[PDB]
């Protein structure tokens, strides 16, 4: 019965002759998670969320298992300066060169921040992660097959959901983590930094340990508690306690009696909630990426440069992807709602908002890339004093160089964070602003021109994802909100690539500058980024071509895998070009000739070979483009930062 319905999609695919094509298979994959509007839509969504939680628990259990069995975590504990490796590679083919793979996910620093000192603890965490994944799968099953409809959670029970998330989940989790810190993560780090052995973590919950050995509640303990690797954990514990208190207090001191989803259908309500949630998660990922190197929070984290770079770049990419998906699902919710009258002011200011954003994007692009091209031209013409640099026309970011304010018992973050900015920082920040504005322009245009436009006046009848409306009106390709998300994903790729390039070059420049020695204290400019990141040629020479030596000379070394992934990423990126530049009709005719060749030999497949649909071709091209570009940057960054740091 249930097993029969497991392949029910395939049975329906083969039931009708119209669905006996490869296009039907691609539609079956594309419409996999597109849970259609029905009485059980909310059940399906919640069960899918719980299943994903189980999948993430499987991933966490696997990571802890690798830390327990296939990692040098104990050696890293004895010497944090060593390379953290947590992936053994068996001797198959000839891959033995890369047998220890330096993991840059920061799990060693995280576990040290959690008070984990024995691989047995990692084994226990892996086992409990598998147990939690099993429980999540059981719950997802149950909710999909036997539970409440959940249709009231976004409109009727939204107050209960929001209040529970505010108090229970968020506040109680922060409070519990503060307790964990104060009780086992601070004392274990104390006894590790002091090198006085670590007892069982439960023995710290004895009321006879340092909890009552001394009642002094400041920075004074046995011998000399002057460990500065330990203070970030103290600050984290204080932050979590304060955050739990403020969340609990403000939740009961908040109205929360305003649900803007009364006017939206359940499917559109789910899509809008997903969009806003994706926006919040993406901006949180970007904020964490900035704060990871802005503020030290994990033990021996800043010392491990590949880990810092990987965390920053990964979370920037995830934030960009989720920010794009936010507008994607906002567009889906708007176009799939029967009466989305809520966005009346913005659908009636469609052209005003879009055109002002268009001017903003045009202005930012011309100005930023013209500063860059002007510097390129002046340096080429031998006119370094006409460039935009510190030794020339100076675009000093004055608004950056001021945070002075009345003290009122504060410190540290009352300034520009102790870093001086120059013309290169100004220009690259404006490049970032322009690229972000262009991505937002594409996404907002897709949202606004989703139900109707001056070109096509019934785009809401065409749903969210359609290839075009036809070659009429001069041509109407790529008008769909899906196609706007498709272009916004390219522009997000461009924006985040430039952002991570800026971060990586600044990071390497700072590492080289702090490698002055000790006596060298006039860094002049030096600061390879600050001196060279003012030209497109400067980038192309001193960042891409300069750092590519590590990734292209990695053959025969443990980074040969990074070199091979570099090549494979280029290959996938050019294959994307193949998919993006070409069109469905040609490939259909080529498949017609190939299918004649098949029929000539009595082969005759019945699932009729159809080339990828227009939207499917665009999606495949975009997937390959993102994979190739992100993989190239991944291989390049990792090889450069592991070989040189």
């Amino acid at each position: 019965d249930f097993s029969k319905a497991a392949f029910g999609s395939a049975t329906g695919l083969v039931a009708k002759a119209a669905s006996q094509t490869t296009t039907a298979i691609w539609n079956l994959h594309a419409d996999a998670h597109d849970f259609s509007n029905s009485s059980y839509l909310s059940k399906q969504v919640f069960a899918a969320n719980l299943a994903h939680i189980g999948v993430v628990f499987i991933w966490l259990s696997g990571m802890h298992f690798h830390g327990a069995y296939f990692s040098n975590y104990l050696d890293w504990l004895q010497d944090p300066s060593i390379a953290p490796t947590a992936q053994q590679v068996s001797n198959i083919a000839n891959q033995s060169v890369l047998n220890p793979i330096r993991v840059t996910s920061g799990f060693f620093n995280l576990w040290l921040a959690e008070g984990i000192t024995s691989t047995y603890q990692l084994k226990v965490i892996a086992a409990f992660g598998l147990i939690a994944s099993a429980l999540c799968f059981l719950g997802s099953y149950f909710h999909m097959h036997s539970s409440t409809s959940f249709t009231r959670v976004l409109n009727t029970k939204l107050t209960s959901l929001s209040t529970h998330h505010l108090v229970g989940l968020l506040g109680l989790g922060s409070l519990a983590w503060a307790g964990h810190l104060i009780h086992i993560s601070l004392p274990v780090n104390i006894l590790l930094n002091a090198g006085v052995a670590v007892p069982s973590p439960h023995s710290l919950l004895s009321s006879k340990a340092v909890a009552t050995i001394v009642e002094q509640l400041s920075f004074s303990a046995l011998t000399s508690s002057d460990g500065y690797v330990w203070q970030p954990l103290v600050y984290s514990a204080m932050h979590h306690f304060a955050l739990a208190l403020v969340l609990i207090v403000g939740s009961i001191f908040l109205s929360t009696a305003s649900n803007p989803l009364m006017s939206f259908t359940v499917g559109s309500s789910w899509h809008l909630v997903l969009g806003v949630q994706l926006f919040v998660t993406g901006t949180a990922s970007v904020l964490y990426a900035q704060m990871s190197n802005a503020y030290p929070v994990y033990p021996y984290l800043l010392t491990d440069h590949p880990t810092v770079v990987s965390l920053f770049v990964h979370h920037m990419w995830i934030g960009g992807f989720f920010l794009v998906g936010a507008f994607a699902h906002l567009s889906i919710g708007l176009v799939r709602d029967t009466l989305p009258q809520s966005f009346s002011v913005v659908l009636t200011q469609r052209d005003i908002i879009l055109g002002h954003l268009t001017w903003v994007v045009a202005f930012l692009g011309v100005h930023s890339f013209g500063l860059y091209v002007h510097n390129d031209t002046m340096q080429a013409l031998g006119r370094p004093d006409d460039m935009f640099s510190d030794n020339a026309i100076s675009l000093l970011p004055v608004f950056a160089r001021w945070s002075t304010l009345t003290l009122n018992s504060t410190g540290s973050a009352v300034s520009v964070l102790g870093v001086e900015l120059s013309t290169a920082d100004f220009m690259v920040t404006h490049i970032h602003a322009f690229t972000i504005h262009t991505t937002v322009l594409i996404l907002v245009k897709g949202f606004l021109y989703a139900r109707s436009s001056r070109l096509v006046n019934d785009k809401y009848k065409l749903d969210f994802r359609y290839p075009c409306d036809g070659p009429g009106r001069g041509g109407t390709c790529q008008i769909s909100p899906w196609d706007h998300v498709f272009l916004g994903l390219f522009w997000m790729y461009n924006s985040i690539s430039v952002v991570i390039f800026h971060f990586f070059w600044e990071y390497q420049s700072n590492l080289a500058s702090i490698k002055a020695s000790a006596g060298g204290s006039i860094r002049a400019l030096a600061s390879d980024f600050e001196l060279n990141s003012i030209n497109t040629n400067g980038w192309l020479r001193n960042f891409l071509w300069s750092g590519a030596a590590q990734v292209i000379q990695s053959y025969g070394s443990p980074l040969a895998a990074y070199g091979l992934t570099f090549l494979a990423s280029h290959f996938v990126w050019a294959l994307s070009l193949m998919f993006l530049f070409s069109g469905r009709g040609y490939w259909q005719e080529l498949i017609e000739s190939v299918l004649w060749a098949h029929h000539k030999l009595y082969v005759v497949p019945h699932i009729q070979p159809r080339a990828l649909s227009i939207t499917s071709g665009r999606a495949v091209g975009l997937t390959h483009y993102l994979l190739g570009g992100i993989g190239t940057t991944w291989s390049f960054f990792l090889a450069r930062i592991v070989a040189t740091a």
């Binding site: 019965d1 249930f2 149950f142 097959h145």
Partner: protein
């Protein structure tokens, strides 16, 4: 089924009288014929074939490293 529940539900109808001592097995009513049919799907069958071929190649490479007998 007046209460809106999803298709293929192992849930008893929530509109019941006083507490019932009834047996409501929460396990999927799967079928051996259905399971065999599902594992015979083109994705499942061909991914299993690909896994078998890949593992066979892995073992051949392990026990006969490189092309020593060329």
């Amino acid at each position: 089924r007046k209460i809106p529940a999803g298709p293929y539900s192992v849930s008893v109808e929530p509109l019941r009288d006083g507490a019932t001592n009834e047996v409501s097995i929460v396990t999927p009513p799967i079928s051996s014929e259905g399971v065999q049919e599902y594992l015979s799907l083109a994705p499942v069958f061909f991914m299993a074939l690909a896994i078998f071929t890949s593992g066979f190649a892995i073992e051949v490479l392990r026990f006969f490293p490189d092309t020593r007998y060329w």
